[model samples]
Target: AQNPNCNIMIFHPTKEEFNDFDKYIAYMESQGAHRAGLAKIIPPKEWKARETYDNISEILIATPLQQVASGRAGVFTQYHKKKKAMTVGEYRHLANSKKYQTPPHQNFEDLERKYWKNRIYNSPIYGADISGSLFDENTKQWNLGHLGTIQDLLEKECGVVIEGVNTPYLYFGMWKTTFAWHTEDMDLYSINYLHLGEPKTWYVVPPEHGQRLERLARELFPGSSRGCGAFLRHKVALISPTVLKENGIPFNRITQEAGEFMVTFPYGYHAGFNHGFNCAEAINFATPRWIDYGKMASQCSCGEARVTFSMDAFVRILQPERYDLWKRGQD
Candidate 1:
């Protein structure tokens, strides 16, 4: 049976709570909401995000070939194939058309037919970094730029802009197309908003269980782990909730509806597939507390995952003003 008892905390933030978003999130974090690795933030009903990509074309589409629940068995690559390109308008057309089928689930048989019979796609509009793009930032309440933790630290202090970390990346998903289990780059907190379209199903492992999940993953996929300590970051390993429950690792599941925001905690491993056609935008942000987590986390030791910024240098910059205070507080 599915782990139905494990619950994901859902926050229906009032206008005030939504406005002072950082404080609200911090409060929730202290309340152990993020212990599940992720939380759901349902914005006020009146809020609406911008949609500016209807005329855009040539977006990269993914054909999910592998079953999301199947064991990788040490195979870490070729989970999906990317060979086609289409416009946002065209994708919407295909998703709504009866000509193609959207699989009912992400199991092996459904995934196989999703490609062979349906010819469906998970089109990812990644790297649509809105910093200098035509689309302006969202309203202040939901804008990544307005997140005090990110705006104050990375933007104000460092004046650095890293795409998908500070700036938002757009993802267009169809049924059963998945993003695998992995922590954020530098273990930073990440915010993903379902701008429009169908709901997305998310599975998150609590921060406390992060290491346990890794250990189990390594034990299950020794060959892949031997190749890289952080093979999960490769976005190839997808562990189902059933597997995690059988292994005694606690996880929470949530369905993120349109207009909802999902915040992932630092070092919290998360993965999920879309319910149907949907567009989600995500970006990584950091709180001051993340400095410790960032320092403890090393870059992906086995892959081409590049270091976008230096933690040591960030600390060096902070030292000018608060270094003495931090040193004394430790004592």
Candidate 2:
């Protein structure tokens, strides 16, 4: 079932793909795609690989094996288990239950004291608002309502459902951070298409190399400087458009077709650098689902899973009330 408020499919088109640029422009004007916010195009590439940098060109997609083995991954799987256990009747019951009802507050302080504590995180990306909960506040229960619209899109467009009860904050910044390159949480499949501007230099590090890199970084920069430490280490993979070689080693450059190049990343550690003068744009899609190792289930039956309390948890923390208001064009 699809959420009414969510646009499950995000369409991205390239400017150079059209046979006639002017004709395409006229078509978009007539169809109101621009005014309706139906499509977005990356202007052009605007950054270059650090001249003295090592290229890490492998993409990592978490797999079911890794999910059951890791603590963080297991947490996501448990969330799915709980979600799948809930029935429609149970959902309505919880929705109408007095235990789930939240008390009204007259001020922001009151709201924060009551709901927003312990749930907010400083976003890694700039110009992106962050807040909300993955679990319900009143009953301290979990539910999928916390995912907002993007999670719905993941389900519809990629045929994958996220299993984590945590609501990942939305990043609307110009560039996504490559701090210690890595991949998605679950063994999801993703396709990344680069359009507009110069190609990026991506680096792929072998699994052992990722480990060594983390160890070296921690050894050099200890304490909080190490950040996630070994957890953040990425297993390397292949870079695109072989022209931009890493360590002076030529890999493979994607031939310029129309205006876009799409590549599928399976699983591994990878990083990319834009080598142009304009802002880069890319579209990514993934299927995120998890499988438990019968740890939570007695019968060992596998089933589709969903997350709980993610929406309530995020909203209670980030409190996007103002942003929501602005989004509705109310202010």
Candidate 3:
């Protein structure tokens, strides 16, 4: 079977060039890189890895182990059925356990039936706001709250913190554990940094193909789509790249290695799975351009009670005059 073969543009910037991160991102966006939905950024070779939370061991958290069809390491077709609670060390040990090793030529189904029931993946860690966590020393440069290029205008307008959206969060992954296809909350742009670990493969559909994905998703899961306008938010769907190509949807694939960053554009649909044990950090931030997308973002209509900030309130604060005209028109 042919796999997804579209390659994402990778940027290699010097340490000095990266220090002006916003400028690099702006240049790329201007170059229409965002048109492909995602881009990869590799820092200079001499750059050292940042101090991550790897040394922390005593902390305990419960997370899901994504279950998928056998031999399909990169595909996820089911939500986790059970939760596992363990300390950082315990989880790491489980992820690296020999009992779960895949035998050569054995497919995922066989491994699931014999050796392991499901893959080990820790749920995301809510950093920035959680206890026993410290902001990285160079947060000023990479922090969304302060990133100069598409400033988090929402945070700047409101003095309060939005936690992971404006701050940052951490994630741990093992083989075959997937983050299903979905767009960022409020259709905001997102950037993920692989602090240090195995590569995470990503598949992204450009903003232009976003609606096509939604249409296909609706056709595939009509009940879910009819139940909620934002069906992908449930994270229950995983379509193969071949299917996407068959339907004429444009997409790109990229593997984000350790110390690299992957940026997703506003309203871009992205999904991927881990190759092995790894830790990554990500945050959602908005550009002034995101205001339009935010306004068009799907809202809760199925009693999901998802917490989301108000784009109208943010727009009102950021552009009072323009907001006045829109509010008056609505009234």
lDDT, candidate 2, 213-329, per-residue tens: 334434433542233323332222112222222223212212211133232232333443222211122322222221221111111001111113432222222234422432232
TM-score of every prediction relative to native: 0.73, 0.28, 0.74
How would you encode candidate 3's per-residue C-alpha lDDT over 18-44 as one tens digit per residue? 677657778777667777778888767
Once fitted onto the true fold, the runs of candidate 2 whose alpha carbons sit more than 4 angstroms away are 1-180, 185-189, 206-213, 224-258, 262-266, 287-331
Clashes of each: 0, 44, 3
C-alpha lDDT score of every prediction, in listed order: 0.62, 0.27, 0.62
lDDT (0-100) at residue 144 of candidate 3? Answer: 38
Candidate 1 residue pairs in clash (backbone atoms < 3 Å): none
Which segments of model 3 are wrong by more than 4 Å?
1-7, 49-54, 62-77, 81-84, 99-135, 138-140, 143-152, 155-165, 308-331
Please provide, for model 1 over 1-331, each residue's C-alpha lDDT reduced to its tens digit, 9 standing for 90 to 100: 2223435678887776777766887887776776677888888776555555454445544432333333332222324434355566666676666533354566544543343232223233222222322134657677754555454566544575533234566776665556778898668899888777777777788877789989988977888888866777666676666568788987877778887889998888998766567777777888766766765653444533433334334433434353344333323
Rank candidates by TM-score, best first. 3, 1, 2
Looking at candidate 1, the ten consecutive residues that score lowest on lDDT are: 125-134
| Candidate 2 deviation (Cα RMSD) | 22.5
